[PDB]
Symmetry: C2
Subunit: 301 residues, 2 copies
């Protein structure tokens, strides 16, 4: 019992974190097999990165894997990330994949400085394709990921802080999440929404953990919910959402539409000083999978 | 910028997590050098563990380090943990220490099942020597820890869930945190309090992150604060607390006693629908060190 913002064990990823330096720019790189991935704004000197990259040679890239120099024997650009071919395959290379996540999906971040892992936290991709992360100067290149049995699914590389303090970055093929670019523009996060399906998964987590207050006798149709949801800046709840909550509905015997009625009342009346799962806010950064994982027993390795 | 419940990178500890089986009991063990540490309630069959342990032989203990059997060549009891001498030193043994933490101090938990690491989360030792953790059956033996440069300071081994769903365990010498025992009694958590020094450190974290609302013109003496603190079930604030908040007072230029006056008003008026650092509650599970670490840049490896 208990419920915690849990992150995946980070060792498999720590073994891949390196330091990439070229010029006066130092950031973090991801070393898989004989490639080191890192953000392309490490390239020297309003940019045009194809120009700047042809301007460069391998020996410009200093790659530090712990105490060991790493010799760059080739480079290339893949959208907003640099692929730096090195002469050594990372012996600690886990089985891995590059996958792109949907808004509302969660992942773990291994925040890094100078290729040294600093901390690990769990977060979600906001519906506006930002993440509310914790990053300081030099965290560029830190990656986000999930673990499934033994496989590391890399989904995120960190590029920049947006003026509101939220964070933007790319998948591991270099394609940004959201309408953001790796150059200095006036770019801002669009207005965010609350991930309704996640809040419902969290409420089930509260019920599983004995917090049964918020529940009620009422029920509601999906349409009538979404009419109230939209009013409170909540994502629409789809039939697929309802199906994905099914197993949690089963395990607790509270029908999905019943839980929506509780959410409806929670939105309309607030919480009146009570709390759910140690929180005075409705939490939207736990998916249905996260709840099941943290309430059934599933491990990884 | 941003602020997250961050946990230490867990790889150094994952390399030490093993599986310990004897009888029909399976739990997690900690493999450092040629010792495997684990809770003693793994011993077979109202207990008297000295009796039960002399009843046993090495070959009763099945120790699984991944795919590799581990041969137990000796055992012994150290308070509530079992030390199982094995014939192989853990090649992945990090530099480490066994340290005992004070209530109010935080640590990372690597929740494990069957020696396989499941997740990592940050938590604090409650003033009543419980932790609000996230554990399922089989998490016994999961360890808590901090990392300081390269050194893993093991501070916690998980033993049991208390009737309120909070968690109790020992340091790595087997001495419990709080008045709890590893036998079936009516034991319960005593009434908890809020870790005042931590809430103040968190408020500084909010100020550092632009959340400047809660602040005010007022001030307060330490005595007058504690008179209001005690009323709201908050730990007393000591002069040493005030000194430890010093650097954060400096960095933000809000005197410690001024921040206490804001806390005083927050306790007296509540938050009026606003939030601090994404929370509608005053958070007491970040120490002054945690805030500085997550707002200055400090790494580990």
């Amino acid at each position: 019992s208990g419920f915690r913002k849990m992150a995946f064990p980070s060792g498999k990823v720590e073994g891949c974190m390196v330091q990439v330096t070229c010029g006066t720019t130092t950031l973090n790189g991801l070393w898989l097999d004989d490639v080191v991935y890192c953000p392309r704004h490490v390239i020297c000197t309003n940019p045009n990165y194809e120009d700047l990259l042809i301007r460069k040679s391998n020996h410009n890239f200093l790659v530090q894997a712990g105490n060991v120099q790493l010799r760059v024997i080739g480079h290339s650009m893949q959208n907003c990330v640099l692929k730096l071919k090195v002469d050594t395959a990372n012996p600690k290379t886990p089985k891995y994949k590059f996958v792109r996540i949907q808004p509302g999906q969660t992942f773990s971040v291994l925040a890094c400085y100078n290729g040294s892992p600093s901390g690990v936290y769990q977060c979600a991709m906001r519906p506006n394709f930002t993440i509310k992360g914790s990053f300081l100067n030099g965290s560029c290149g830190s990656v986000g990921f999930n673990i499934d049995y033994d496989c590391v699914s890399f989904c995120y590389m960190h590029h920049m802080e947006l003026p509101t303090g939220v964070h933007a970055g790319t998948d591991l093929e270099g394609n940004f999440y959201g309408p953001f670019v790796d150059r200095q523009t006036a770019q801002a996060a669009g207005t965010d929404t609350t991930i309704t399906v996640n809040v419902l998964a969290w409420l089930y987590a509260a019920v599983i953990n004995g917090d049964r207050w918020f529940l009620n006798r009422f029920t509601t149709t999906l349409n009538d919910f979404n009419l109230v949801a939209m009013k409170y800046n909540y994502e629409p709840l789809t039939q697929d959402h309802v199906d994905i909550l099914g197993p949690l509905s089963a395990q607790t015997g509270i029908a999905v539409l019943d839980m929506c009625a509780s959410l409806k009342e929670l939105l309309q009346n607030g919480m009146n000083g009570r709390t759910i799962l140690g929180s005075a806010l409705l939490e939207d950064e736990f998916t249905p999978f996260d709840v099941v994982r943290q309430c059934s027993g599933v491990t990884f390795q």
